[PDB]
Write a protein that binds this ligand. Structure first.
Ligand SMILES: [Cl-]
Ligand SMILES: [Mg+2]
Ligand SMILES: [Mg+2]
Ligand SMILES: [Mg+2]
Ligand code: NA
Length: 328
DNA sequence: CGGCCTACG
DNA sequence: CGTAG
DNA sequence: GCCG
């Protein structure tokens, strides 16, 4: 009664097993910091199964038969049910390795590999990093200078204001181009740590060269605190107005041709785990190769045309899930 | 045991 | 290496 | 870590 892939079941944003899923997610995150992507995936998948259940797990019996629950994830849940805490989870939470890797990887421009190297060198705090700016990229310098603002949640109210300013620049860059809110806010989140936008134009080909024109215009309006500069994804830090001041916010801008827009919308709406699971399902169960540009049949050597996300779910033999049910 | 999503900057 | 969902 |  519980399918094995997250793309085969609705997952709402709020659910009935929040504490259990959060614990499993700590173990997933810690596995990622050690480079164990397989263990990360299993703990993420097990967490997501609990998000999709219709009521709280109250007894270990209720895990029997659920996919992605083996000895380890079951023991975590058992300890939480019996004692309200899991010793392994709490040991990870208080560990210097976990806390420092979490802090470093949260920096824009720093991934697991950089964070791990800094950890092995003995670095532990952001001020440690600030004291040797020679070992930092321009991107990392920006991420470090803006880290405090970037750690503050972006509210839905902030999103609406940002969308209007992006639409103004996009309209001058290319009249008729459109801006669609994606990522977590499209799935119904009330907060986030960034804002994701997808830009297209109804006339195929007109979107070529668009993103540099949009970036130049936002830069000229004084709104860009940082960006990496032909391109189609821009990872920016924007100046967002606040009462009597402003704050830095991460904004991602993506361009797609309208022929690819359903695939880009699907990919950029997420969740991350939902999309990994959907691509895994496509390839392993249907023999089709999915990305944010299209869906390829490698036997016929043809690309599926899609005019909607609904088309893509139908192509893959899956019941449609609206964005609010993709919170795997 | 092999596999674990698949891109772009 | 970083980034994204 | 789990699935097939
Ligand atoms: Cl692993
Ligand atoms: Mg986002
Ligand atoms: Mg983003
Ligand atoms: Mg992210
Ligand atoms: Na980072």
């Amino acid at each position: 009664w519980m399918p094995a892939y997250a793309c085969q079941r609705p997952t709402p944003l709020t659910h009935h097993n929040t504490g259990l899923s959060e614990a499993l997610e700590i173990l997933a995150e810690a596995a990622g910091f050690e480079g164990s992507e397989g263990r990360l995936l299993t703990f993420c998948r097990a967490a997501s199964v609990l998000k999709a259940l219709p009521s709280p797990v109250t007894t270990l019996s209720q895990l029997q038969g659920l996919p992605h629950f083996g000895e380890h994830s079951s023991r975590v849940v058992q300890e939480l049910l019996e004692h309200g805490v899991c010793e392994e989870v709490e040991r990870v939470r208080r560990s210097e390795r976990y806390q420092t890797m979490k802090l470093f990887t949260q920096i824009f421009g720093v991934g697991v590999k950089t964070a791990d190297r800094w950890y092995r060198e003995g670095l532990r705090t952001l001020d440690d990093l600030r004291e040797q700016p020679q070992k930092l990229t321009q991107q990392q310098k920006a991420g470090l200078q803006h880290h405090q603002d970037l750690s503050t949640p972006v509210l839905r109210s902030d999103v609406d204001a940002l969308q209007q300013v992006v639409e103004e620049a996009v309209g001058q860059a290319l009249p008729g181009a459109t801006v669609t809110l994606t990522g977590g806010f499209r799935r119904g989140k009330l907060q986030g740590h960034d804002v994701d936008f997808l830009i297209t134009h109804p006339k195929e080909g007109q979107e070529a060269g668009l993103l540099p024109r949009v970036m130049c215009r936002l830069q000229d309006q004084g709104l860009i605190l940082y960006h990496q500069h032909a391109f189609e994804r821009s990872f920016c830090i924007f100046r967002l107005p606040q009462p009597g001041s402003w704050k830095a916010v991460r904004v991602d801008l993506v361009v797609a041709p309208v022929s690819q827009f359903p695939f880009a919308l699907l990919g950029w709406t997420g969740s991350k785990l939902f999309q990994r699971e959907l691509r895994r399902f496509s390839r392993k169960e249907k023999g089709l190769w999915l990305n944010s540009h299209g869906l390829f049949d490698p036997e016929q050597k043809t690309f599926f045309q899609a005019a909607s996300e609904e088309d893509i779910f139908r192509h893959l033999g899956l019941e449609y899930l609206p964005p609010e049910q993709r919170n795997a």
